[PDB]
Design a protein around this ligand. Structure first.
Ligand SMILES: CCCCCC(=O)OC[C@H](O)COP(=O)(O)O
Length: 110
């Protein structure tokens, strides 16, 4: 099992909250997200660098600023529509790419 947090690259994501943690279990192929005010378990596909997933999200009312909510909504919508994941052979950082730009990066660890 590996975990990552997001560092936003695109401005649509500058208000994303910092405590979202993304987990991937290699044994059982499970992908979850966890945080104080959000959780989700992914139904997903990942083929040829293309990731698409539905996280079945739960969100705590009133916990987020309007700006955070919009960023969070956009994030899950984008992950549903599909993104390209770019890993590397140096470390476990992964770029999330869509529509010609890097949208965010996944950095290993809490
Ligand atoms: C916020 C980004 C969506 C979460 C998707 C995710 O963390 O995927 C992990 C991926 O399956 C690991 O495979 P890789 O190490 O071969 O790239």
């Amino acid at each position: 099992e590996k975990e990552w947090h997001i560092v936003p690259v695109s401005k649509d994501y500058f208000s994303i909250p910092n405590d979202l943690l993304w987990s991937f279990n290699t044994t059982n192929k499970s992908i979850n997200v966890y945080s104080k005010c959000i959780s989700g378990k992914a139904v997903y596909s990942f083929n040829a660098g293309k990731f698409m997933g539905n996280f079945n999200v739960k969100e705590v009312d009133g916990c987020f600023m309007d700006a955070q909510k919009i960023a969070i909504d956009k994030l899950f919508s984008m992950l549903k529509d599909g993104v390209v994941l770019k890993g590397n052979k140096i470390n476990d950082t992964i770029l999330i790419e869509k529509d010609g730009e890097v949208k965010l990066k996944l950095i290993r660890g809490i």
